[PDB]
């Protein structure tokens with residue numbers, strides 16, 4: 001049993017960019033979520049092998065985690081803020097799809113998502 005290769009955090013063939021919105025996503029949004037008490041299970045890809053979740057990557061085909069997002073932001077991997085927002089939304093959605101409603105990990109994701117939405121509500125223009 002193995003985990004898939006993690007999502008790429010850079011790619012020489014994908015145009016790269018920095019915008020004030022992407023700077024906000026790294027400096028304000030990611031930072032705020034990263035330090036939350038519930039953040040640690042989301043700071044790296046799910047190790048389905050060590051967690052003994054053999055069906056995890058049979059079900060979740062678009063994995064995403066905040067460690068990947070952090071590195072993408074640091075590497076200027078994204079062209080725009082929408083791409084990064086989509087990664088956050090993919091992470092939350094994956095958690096709601098794989099896990100039973102009311103599971104602790106779901107409650108943790110829900111708290112992180114509420115904070116995410118509060119922070120992105122003030123995403124600056126441009």
Ligand SMILES: C/C=C/Cn1cc(-c2cccc(C(=O)N(C)C)c2)c2cc[nH]c2c1=O
Nearest residue numbers: 041042044045046051064065095098099105
């Ligand atoms: C990238 C984030 C994915 C979210 N996620 C994380 C873990 C997980 C990851 C690492 C550690 C732990 C853990 O040991 N906990 C929460 C006690 C859980 C887990 C265990 C069952 N379902 C999930 C799950 O959906």
